Design a protein around this ligand. Structure first.
Ligand SMILES: Cc1cc2nc3c(=O)[nH]c(=O)nc-3n(C[C@H](O)[C@H](O)[C@H](O)COP(=O)(O)OP(=O)(O)OC[C@H]3O[C@@H](n4cnc5c(N)ncnc54)[C@H](O)[C@@H]3O)c2cc1C
Ligand SMILES: Cc1cc2nc3c(=O)[nH]c(=O)nc-3n(C[C@H](O)[C@H](O)[C@H](O)COP(=O)(O)OP(=O)(O)OC[C@H]3O[C@@H](n4cnc5c(N)ncnc54)[C@H](O)[C@@H]3O)c2cc1C
Ligand SMILES: COc1ccc(CC2=NCCC3=C2CCCC3)cc1
Ligand SMILES: COc1ccc(CC2=NCCC3=C2CCCC3)cc1
Lengths: 450, 450
């Protein structure tokens, strides 16, 4: 006797979407979530902050994403463009260089090597591919070196190196000395290339949902009603010839199939009986979350526009950030958003909270002008302290893992299927990947139920 | 109101010893253990195997270890020498070279570069030190490269490279492409140097306890009686100004202090409230267990001695092992013990159990002669599937971790103290380190109780 046909573990976008698809087909589903809320690495509030809704986790929609906007539309959400005209900034340890709209500064001495380094990175990625990077003839060597070592071998300009360092410390939440070059190159390729991932005008970042990205999971949970269990951290998964038992301490739920819709690192904390196969066990134990914090400051007006600036800034150096204008036309205040990750976040953490806020204000003054001092609201979200997530924005891998265990990112283990964005064939790391992986897992399980 | 003065988490040698020391001073202690047994990575049975007691985990005592033999003596255990005279073997993808007792084969073409590579490794280790390797001026660069890269830069002989590869895959349970060179060099230095760790006649491996190493923890548990809780996996630690609450699901225990006597990876599965400081959180998430299996075959007699062989073999190559004669004079059968780790264990795992046993017998026949076919008993212990341990023999670290978070190996966090062998100033990775770290944590907590 079963409590459900399928138990879905994790109510982020991936698990919420898989549960929704199954429920929509009349499958009996339980969606169990460790935290006191749904959303996972997406998290927002319509009213807790002055000036309008605010997002604490992932919030941007890409121009080639389709599951995400279609889901949003189906749930009744409206999008607004996130694109910010004006001159983007490239800042090198406080020395500000002004782009031409989203392009490099006029006559920048580093533009040529930057373009060549991006082409080289894309070529490494293409040699690995998204379908099966672990099977590529080039992966063993690439997976035995770090991104930092690849930069040392292929980049000479300090500006280009610092741009690549901020890219990795942000988009993988980890230092170039920590991330396998094979993993990084695969990650960028399967996100449709480097221009896709760093473009402010076209690429993976062009729109937002009015009201916050957290709505997506909340609305799904609304419809699932009592089949959602919050405060239900899974501690053990047992399998047998006729189904799967999922435990939270002594609490238990029985089903025919289960879907793990959380990062490999989340699986590593669970006990499996029988034990998982070796590649999946190693993957869960050795693919950590990156580390990332998201600092937001609100103002009466987007005063950076007085200097003809977009508010986008690649703030490179010892305390590197990515900064953007996060303001929506329907907000009553303007918002600047700063992200800091990896080794830069390690440095940020070594400062006091007061020193951090003062340092960020000084960066905003340097980049955007003195009116940055007239703050209305300041907020920091440290993803490394969020229970049952423990980091951000994505999973990364150190040397040796992708080539020796990456095939376990997607393969089911008997009656346990894997969703979560890390399992997506493309757009792993992104909400779109969460949704694609949830769709795949739901389809596979539905086929086994028929 | 408290259940105990101190809660010790983990009943391996470290936590058992810390609980014992506290209890001996009249402190009220609880020792809580996740598994259905005490011992952790030590594990033995007096009677389940034909031919005498057998050890499934760590069992050797070193010549400079003192807490371990003194504890054994205090508990009523007797030691016996483990040293095996005869010619040790150095095997390179099946080509057997016969040592002169424990020394390299007469006139070996690789002897000179081997000695130089060992001296070089010791010198790297000495540059880092055991007291505070994370503070050494040399650690950032060393921690940004792998052991494999250091070998590529400093070793040319294939024999010497393969010897170093088996050393790392066994002693850290991980590939040379996975382990930070800084971590490996520090690990060897703090184990008193490479000759200490690989010597068959003098060094870290000279004696055993008759009856099995598991006795150490079992006897301690006997005296602690009902203050030991088995099947009590800690899932959450909460701290406040007056003490610490430790949870296993909904079950809870309250004390004034707690000691975590388990690897950083064990801590990563727990929820901490308040959250741990950043360096400790990163250390727990990013310092994995190595991977290791221990295969044992019993025979009527140590027939390898018919060829003048000790039974020790460094079996190098694609499927590398360390082999030793594990026979005690009081056993009624002879025992050969094989260890396989890291990338070699990955290969081992890709074979069927039957193919593994046949392959091991073929290795024994090649190395020691045809009588290896006349088996009496065969047993494998795969440490990667042991619940709440998940690997062996030790914790390792990938690039970037020791230099950015290693200072969190030993430092208490408010009322939570860290024991476990990884916290030992010296002999981290070994039972002696477990005991030293337990002694330190017990002393610190006792001082806070007075
Ligand atoms: C600051 C930040 C900014 C980001 N920006 C963007 C952006 O602009 N665009 C983009 O596309 N993506 C962005 N992301 C990434 C996006 O948030 C993730 O890709 C996405 O949320 C992945 O969804 P998921 O469902 O796979 O996993 P998650 O969102 O991590 O959900 C996993 C769920 O599993 C739960 N869980 C974990 N362990 C257990 C357990 N033992 N038992 C039960 N439940 C458990 C967790 O609590 C969580 O709710 C951002 C992320 C962060 C942190
Ligand atoms: C095959 C093998 C051979 C070895 N050979 C040797 C040798 O010859 N010499 C040597 O000196 N060392 C050897 N060792 C290493 C030695 O076993 C370890 O150094 C030692 O056991 C470390 O002791 P510990 O108490 O620090 O940790 P462990 O022995 O790992 O004990 C940790 C304990 O914590 C428990 N625990 C974990 N998570 C939780 C939780 N959430 N709640 C409650 N309890 C929890 C575990 O179940 C375990 O009992 C060997 C190890 C292996 C695997
Ligand atoms: C080039 O401009 C942008 C603007 C916004 C984002 C959103 C985003 N997506 C992936 C995860 C992450 C971020 C932003 C910062 C840190 C982590 C990305 C590129
Ligand atoms: C040079 O001879 C030996 C013999 C025995 C051991 C015991 C030992 N201690 C550290 C952990 C570990 C082993 C042995 C194999 C694998 C892992 C070491 C060296």
């Amino acid at each position: 006797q079963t409590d459900a046909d399928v138990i879905v573990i994790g109510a982020g976008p991936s698990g919420s979407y898989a549960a929704k698809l199954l429920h929509d087909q009349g499958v009996r589903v339980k969606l169990v979530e460790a935290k006191d809320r749904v959303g996972g690495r997406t998290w927002s509030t319509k009213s807790d902050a002055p000036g309008g809704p605010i997002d604490f986790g992932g919030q941007w929609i890409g121009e080639t994403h389709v599951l995400l906007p279609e889901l949003g539309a189906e749930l009744g959400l409206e999008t607004v463009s996130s694109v910010k005209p004006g001159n983007d900034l490239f800042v090198f340890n406080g020395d500000v260089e002004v782009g031409e709209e989203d392009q490099v500064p006029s006559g920048a001495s580093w533009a040529g090597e930057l373009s060549r380094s991006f082409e080289l990175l894309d070529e490494v990625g293409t040699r690995l591919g998204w379908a099966a990077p672990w099977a590529s003839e080039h992966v063993g060597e690439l997976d035995s070196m770090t991104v930092a070592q690849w930069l040392e071998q292929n980049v000479q300009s300090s500006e280009v190196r610092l741009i690549h360092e901020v890219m990795v410390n942000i988009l993988n939440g980890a230092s170039t000395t920590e991330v396998s070059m094979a993993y990084w190159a695969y990650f960028v390729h399967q996100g449709e290339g480097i221009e896709s991932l760093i473009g402010t005008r076209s690429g993976a970042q062009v729109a937002w949902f009015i009201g916050g990205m957290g709505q997506v999971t909340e609305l799904i949970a609304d419809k699932l009603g009592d089949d959602v269990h919050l405060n239900w951290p899974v501690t053990r998964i047992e399998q047998d010839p006729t189904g799967v038992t999922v435990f939270s301490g002594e609490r238990r739920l029985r089903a025919s199939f289960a879907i793990l819709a959380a990062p490999p690192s989340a699986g590593s904390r669970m006990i499996f009986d029988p034990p998982l196969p070796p590649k999946r066990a190693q993957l869960q134990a050795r693919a950590p979350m990156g580390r990332l914090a998201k600092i937001q400051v609100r103002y009466d007006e987007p005063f950076w526009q007085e200097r003809g600036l977009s508010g986008a800034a690649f703030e490179c150096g010892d305390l590197a950030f990515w900064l953007f204008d996060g303001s929506k036309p329907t907000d009553s205040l303007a918002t600047i958003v700063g992200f800091i990750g990896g080794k830069h976040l390690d440095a940020w953490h070594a400062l006091s909270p007061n020193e951090r806020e003062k340092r960020f204000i000084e960066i905003l003054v340097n980049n955007f002008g003195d009116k940055a001092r007239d703050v209305r609201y300041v907020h920091e979200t440290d993803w490394t302290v969020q229970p049952w997530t423990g980091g951000a924005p994505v999973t990364f891998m150190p040397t040796g893992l992708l080539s020796s265990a990456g095939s376990a990112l997607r393969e089911p283990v008997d009656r346990l299927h894997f969703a979560g964005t890390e399992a997506a064939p493309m757009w792993s790391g992104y909400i779109e990947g969460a949704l694609r992986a949830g769709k795949i897992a739901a389809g596979d399980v539905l086929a086994r139920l028929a």
